Amino acid sequence: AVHLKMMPEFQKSSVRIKNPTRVEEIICGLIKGGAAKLQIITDFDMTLSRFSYNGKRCPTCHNIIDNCKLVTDECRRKLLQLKEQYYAIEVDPVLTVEEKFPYMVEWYTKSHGLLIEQGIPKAKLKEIVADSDVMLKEGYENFFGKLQQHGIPVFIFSAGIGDVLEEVIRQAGVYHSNVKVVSNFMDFDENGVLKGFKGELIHVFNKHDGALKNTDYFSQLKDNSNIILLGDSQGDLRMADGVANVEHILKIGYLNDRVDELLEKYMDSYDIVLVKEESLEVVNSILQKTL
Ligand SMILES: [Mg+2]
Predict the structure, then answer these.
(1) What separation in Å is there between the alpha carbon of 149 and the centre of ligand 1?
(2) 45 is catalytic
């Protein structure tokens, strides 16, 4: 029997929940099923990593390269100008999510295009990452560690850059066997220098597409019919569209930004909404009762 009232992690002021009885019933399904039926499906940028530290804005995977020493101030100016004009579309109240698709395709293509120009070697991503200002959410050793310990599938599904992501987690010591990473991976020329990106593009609004194109992975996990989903965008709610069967799914959303404009919508679509929150402790607390 689950009582949110008696879990101190749910009493923190950043936790918003439209439907506490509904959430208690989902978590109770999670606990009943135990390890055998659990899998995690998760975004990375701003979900597993922090949106801010010590008054400062934290880098996305892409930002790690934008900001590194192999990239010119004139490239950074251009990249900023793309952010300006395209982010305004991303967040445009009037356009339907579907209308923003071609815009997003353009933005990520152009900005990946500028990085291919800078000449980024694979051999160098280790150092770039080590020198960067990236940070994982408080509680990440525990999150990943209980999950590896119990062999729980973790599907990290990212519109970032996959080589960067994987380097972050490897240097954190948490890129264990149970962790599968699906992202935009770089394509290297025979000098081991970035020439383009592999596969089809994952951006913020089309994770339905990628989720259905990973059927292999999901059908292997048919028995894992209890899911915990973690994201920070509305688009991350699509990340479970490929799952074989669902008995219980819990959806946890990081509302980092645009709090007043988006609270009602986030509270409406995510089960738990974590407001300006830089830790994984609510999810860790669920893992502790479940595992
Ligand atoms: Mg994200």
Answers:
(1) 26
(2) yes
Give residues with Cβ within 8 angstroms of 202, minimum separation 6.
157, 158, 159, 182, 183, 184, 209, 210
Give the up-direction half-sphere exposure of residue 163: CA atoms within 13 A in the CB hemisphere.
Answer: 22
Residue 216: active-site member: no
37 in a known ligand binding site: no
Cα 48 to ligand 1 centre (Å): 8
Please give the C-alpha separations between residue 231 and each of 119, 269, 273, in angstroms, as whole numbers.
31, 11, 10
111 is in an annotated binding site: yes
* CA 84 to ligand 1 centroid distance, Å: 18
Method: X-ray
Class of domain 60-133: mainly alpha
Tokens of 219: 């059908």
Pick 1-47+134-187+206-291's CATH classification: 3.40.50.1950, 3.40.50.1000, 3.30.360.10, 3.20.20.10.
Answer: 3.40.50.1000
